[PDB]
Design a protein around this ligand. Sequence first.
Ligand SMILES: [Co+2]
Ligand SMILES: [Co+2]
Lengths: 226, 226, 203, 203
Amino acid sequence: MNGVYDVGGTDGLGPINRPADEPVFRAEWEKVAFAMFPATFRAGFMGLDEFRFGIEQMNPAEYLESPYYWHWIRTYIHHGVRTGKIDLEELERRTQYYRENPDAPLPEHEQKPELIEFVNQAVYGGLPASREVDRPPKFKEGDVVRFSTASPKGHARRARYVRGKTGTVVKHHGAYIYPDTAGNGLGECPEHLYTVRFTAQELWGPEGDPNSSVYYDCWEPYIELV
Amino acid sequence: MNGVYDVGGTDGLGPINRPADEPVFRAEWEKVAFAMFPATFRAGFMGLDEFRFGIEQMNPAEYLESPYYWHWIRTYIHHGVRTGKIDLEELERRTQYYRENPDAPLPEHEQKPELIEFVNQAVYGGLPASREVDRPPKFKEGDVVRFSTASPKGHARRARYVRGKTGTVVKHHGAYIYPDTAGNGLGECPEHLYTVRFTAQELWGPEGDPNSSVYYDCWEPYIELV
Amino acid sequence: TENILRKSDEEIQKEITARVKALESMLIEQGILTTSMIDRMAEIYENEVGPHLGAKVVVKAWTDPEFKKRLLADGTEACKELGIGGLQGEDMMWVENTDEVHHVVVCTLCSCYPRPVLGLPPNWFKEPQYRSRVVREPRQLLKEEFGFEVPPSKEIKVWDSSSEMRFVVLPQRPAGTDGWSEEELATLVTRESMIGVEPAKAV
Amino acid sequence: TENILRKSDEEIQKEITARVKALESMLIEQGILTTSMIDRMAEIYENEVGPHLGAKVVVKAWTDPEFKKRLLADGTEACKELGIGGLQGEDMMWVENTDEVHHVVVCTLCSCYPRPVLGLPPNWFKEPQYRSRVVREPRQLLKEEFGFEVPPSKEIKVWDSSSEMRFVVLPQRPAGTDGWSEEELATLVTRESMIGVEPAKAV
Ligand SMILES: [Co+2]
Ligand SMILES: [Co+2]
């Protein structure tokens, strides 16, 4: 989708706010929000591409200025409603309850070894997205290609700043989960993946740095020979 | 500039809010904000192109959800600071004063016939932007042209959705004030102006309406033959 | 749209009101803004300039083919025939709805609108929802928001007012109105019909 | 940045806290989230995984040309030599700063970052200020924000992590460090130097 969240090349967003140091987690609610990712992923709320798409559907004014882990909460609720696993009325009632009784207990529950094993395995084992496919790569290093001007309304990884621009294939990586299917719940449908080099003149015109290039990763359908 | 305010083609902004009716002015402060335009324009704070650029430099999160005439206030303050006609410290003090004393009087002042005459003349006479220039038009009806991928950091009228796209010249209008100079305080520098027709397929790829076109106005430097 | 970061409408109005009164006090002291200037602008666009003016133009074009020709050739000059013109209509171009083409106007970069014939735009025209969507999904937007179904085979032409050219739609004359008076025909012409978001009123 | 519409930080935190506790109560009742799962994730990224791991990789590459070769050929496989790897580093590609090229990494679409070697990204990396600007004015951004002046003649290559490939910068070895130990060299390697926003520490 052509969301505001695809911010590369947007002007006017202001200077970077970078404190001299910062903790990994600024508040206990951020640790909760962070750990909710393996929890909802294991539970089938969403895969990684679908998680990103939920964030992209946020109110852009809320997206631009909210704490980052709030984006994570929005996407869990999005997918919880989508899949019928979260009742919004119940969530709204519970929110007010914890607004009025912030120190009330969480619900009684049992700890589960299998959740600790799931987390350690994800963290240290990884969740690789590479896949084998039947077809060989369409493109190769040195090929000069143009990026698609398609504008899907669902999830994709087609930054507006690269669309219709011409670049050179730098590397073929093998095939991977394809976001335009996976993030829209249409499955992995893996496609070959390439890094492509675009000059700053190609991307920005004469306002580009004269000695700069951006490398962006393109799934096969995103590019064709010029 | 590549601001968020250039919203054509952005997805995710949500459904239109359209009440069944509405007044022209929703509150007395909007009448003030509206009338401040001829007042600051006559006073030399800004011309029309410069007024638009001040709004484009807003915090995008504030832009997207504020009342429209608040954008006007931001641009008057921007240009008042730029030109040294508004002292921000004094403005900040006066704001708090009227926060704490909302019904305090405005300053004693004299009415001025010349301001009423200025307003009636602007409204009914107009402020035409057409200008005569030395050179004839470079382009003509039927010419197939591509829109520039330049990305100025100051004011311009180069919607990101049209950049690098190909369209056909529909009409030449004569020359007009050129925004890329005028909105950056570099003067009128008038350029010929054309309407150009872009298909929805050209703009949006296969997600475009198959039977639709967008007409966009291009100053001469914005376009070249394909 | 929900934004957990946003103050209430009442808090926002209270803050804007103070900010505006402060800036007003400064411009008053500069001698550049007065209460009668503010009142005059508000009277002109509350009561003098508004879509009743465009409606007169439309009905003349419907009942006068030579005027319609002049109106489509040079909208500013044609509208001056009726004493209509001025600020933010110095360069009007009117475009004609037909059985083959439907037109809709937008200012994707801001809010530009043909003020001398329509007065100031309604809020939804100036807001990012309409502005973002109409150049990309005009047929869906007209259906979903305005109840207006433009069949897939009919071309929709969207005019984005990026320059000081101000586009105005001449809507098609409703069936069933043969020989009606200019006054009767005017009851059918709405601002929405001159923006292109609705047709002129049936009946 | 000032936004007259926005609640205070304290009001925003108070609302988020309630919303999160509510959602937490529901996921707890579903049996899918527990206090020990939450505590485990926080311990791993507070104390187990972080840029000290990337620093070990950098210093090995600086002191071992054959390893450096392996690291630039296949970053995941090379880092596994040191027992380093996992989530959001399943496909690492390291890129080498030299006198001719300077590299900087970004996730313009979100916040993607090479977690197994750097831990979670600092807030400024995930925010729209850095993400929007670095692909368009990288030389100015490095000067203005990081005090880092890359001469105009040196190419700056910006790597936008749009796929699950995770780019990591191998910064150039500071002058004056010949024959230093791996432990001494590590004191020079910062997360910023592996993002490409600063060079490794002088001295
Ligand atoms: Co406008
Ligand atoms: Co990311």
